Ligand binder design. Structure first.
Ligand SMILES: CCOP(O)(=S)OCC
Ligand SMILES: [Co+2]
Ligand SMILES: [Fe+2]
Length: 328
């Protein structure tokens, strides 16, 4: 019945299966992979790395990932389609804007941004015909004036298409509350919205407050920890000093408080990464060699061993993403 758009075209919602709802093939910038593919070794090396990673995830039971790279994360939909085909894993692509918009975006009005997001959802990204299945937005603290427009434009595009909205927050600053206020001012249903990087905080007052309102809570940085790397300032700043087990306990905490239907789980992983320090990808691959298999291989058994029922784990990893992604 319900369909969702992937980089290989439409798929039935029921085929999405075990779905990681916040991932990247490559975290980069608009135009960068085209202008400087050698940064990644080569485009071919990048694609091969991504195919090996997604095949590993697939072997662990992952059937679909949502690549939340926007235009300004340097999303390359042809790359996503190539690797999706080679690895046989569905990929849902994104529209929206993250927190590195260039001037040609920052100068735009809410109307103009709505038109852009609609173009990528309804017509296709660039000249490819590949349609976005989610809208990615971001704040890092209080929203900038431009970020206010972006969140309103995302709400309007979601209302028009039924495609969900997913967010980057600075979770320690509780950005989700302001994001929610902006979304609701536009009349967007909280069930269409995932407040992301919510596992970057242990503030369950903040998290249950959102979940109580109907928001999905993105616990989407599972493998991130610089424990043991504290001498590496850049890894420390990006990864944090909380263990993956600490992050994973949040999933249990929300399930134990009645919020099992409001949780989405992912890694925020990537196979190339040019928007941060050089060789950050080598540090990450050492910390988490399992890549996007880490959730099914480590997180889901950890939870099962803590007594979370399999039905509940299936509801979190299959039913929740399905309900979220289904245009509504
Ligand atoms: C660690 C990854 O965080 P981000 O997806 S906000 O960076 C862009 C790839
Ligand atoms: Co983010
Ligand atoms: Fe991300």
């Amino acid at each position: 019945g319900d369909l969702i758009n992937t980089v290989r075209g439409p798929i039935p919602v029921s085929e999405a299966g075990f779905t990681l709802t916040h991932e990247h093939i490559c975290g980069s910038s608009a135009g960068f992979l085209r202008a400087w593919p050698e940064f990644f070794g080569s485009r071919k090396a990048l694609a091969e790395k991504a195919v090996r990673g997604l095949r590993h995830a697939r072997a662990a039971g992952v059937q679909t990932i949502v690549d939340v790279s926007t235009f300004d994360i340097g999303r390359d939909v042809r790359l996503l389609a190539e690797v999706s085909r080679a690895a046989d894993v569905h990929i849902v692509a994104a529209t929206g804007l993250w927190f590195d918009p260039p001037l040609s975006m920052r100068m735009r009005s809410v109307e103009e941004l709505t038109q852009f997001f609609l173009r990528e959802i309804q017509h296709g990204i660039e000249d490819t015909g590949i349609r976005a299945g989610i809208i990615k937005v971001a704040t890092t603290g209080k929203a900038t004036p431009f970020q206010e427009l972006v969140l309103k434009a995302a709400a309007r595009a979601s209302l028009a298409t039924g495609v969900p909205v997913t967010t980057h927050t600075s979770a320690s600053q509780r950005d989700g509350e302001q994001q929610a206020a902006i979304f609701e001012s536009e009349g967007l249903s909280p069930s269409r919205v995932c407040i992301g990087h919510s596992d970057d905080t242990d503030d369950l007052s903040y998290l249950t407050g959102l979940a109580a309102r109907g928001y999905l809570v993105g616990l989407d940085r599972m493998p991130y920890s610089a424990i043991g790397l504290e001498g590496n300032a850049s890894a420390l700043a990006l990864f944090g000093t909380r263990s993956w087990q600490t992050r994973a306990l949040l999933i249990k905490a929300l399930i134990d408080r009645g919020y099992k239907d409001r949780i989405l789980v992912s890694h925020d992983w990537l196979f190339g990464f040019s928007s941060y320090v050089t060789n950050i990808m080598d540090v990450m691959d050492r910390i988490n060699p399992d890549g996007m298999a880490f959730v099914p291989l480590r997180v889901i058994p950890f939870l099962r061993e803590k007594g979370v029922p399999p039905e509940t784990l299936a509801g979190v990893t299959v039913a929740n993403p399905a309900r979220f992604l289904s245009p509504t």
